[PDB]
Amino acid sequence: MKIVYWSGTGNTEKMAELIAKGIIESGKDVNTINVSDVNIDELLNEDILILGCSAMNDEVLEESEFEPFIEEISTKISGKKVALFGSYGWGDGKWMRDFEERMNGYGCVVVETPLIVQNEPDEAEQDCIEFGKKIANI
Numbered sequence: 001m002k003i004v005y006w007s008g009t010g011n012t013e014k015m016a017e018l019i020a021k022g023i024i025e026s027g028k029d030v031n032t033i034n035v036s037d038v039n040i041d042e043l044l045n046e047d048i049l050i051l052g053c054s055a056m057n058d059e060v061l062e063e064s065e066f067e068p069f070i071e072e073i074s075t076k077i078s079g080k081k082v083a084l085f086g087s088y089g090w091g092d093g094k095w096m097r098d099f100e101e102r103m104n105g106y107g108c109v110v111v112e113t114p115l116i117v118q119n120e121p122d123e124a125e126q127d128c129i130e131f132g133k134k135i136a137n138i
């Protein structure tokens with residue numbers, strides 16, 4: 001499997017790592033890829049797309065790298081299964097509600113409730129691992 005993410009200070013990156021650990025613990029292999037190093041063609045062959053991005057202003061996906069990536073794959077992901085996650089600070093998850101709506105709008109099937117954690121995982125570490133385990137059970 002593959003996990004693609006954008007992280008500005010490392011919070012979402014840490015989540016990606018933990019999610020990967022859960023998939024690996026379930027017996028499967030997974031590679032975490034920063035959005036800047038992703039190859040669209042290879043990503044599009046995947047059964048499930050696991051995508052993560054922290055909340056940027058104002059309650060939107062990161063604009064210089066992540067959003068362009070999403071816009072680029074938008075027309076080629078109808079029917080694909082996707083799992084969403086990300087870290088946020090002061091909001092209540094609005095950016096993720098929108099991200100979920102957007103992906104559904106492109107024809108994707110959002111397989112699980114998006115995982116959102118405030119700031120660094122730390123206390124939510126097991127939650128991240130468990131989310132990975134749920135995806136591996138799909």
Ligand SMILES: Cc1cc2nc3c(=O)[nH]c(=O)nc-3n(C[C@H](O)[C@H](O)[C@H](O)COP(=O)(O)O)c2cc1C
Nearest residue numbers: 007008009010011012054055056057059089090091
């Ligand atoms: C410029 C900027 C704008 C932000 N806007 C929001 C926002 O609208 N809502 C929110 O909850 N957090 C907001 N945050 C906080 C980040 O989502 C939060 O610090 C998160 O933990 C960053 O994760 P990352 O290290 O993976 O980037 C913003 C952070 C930055 C740097």
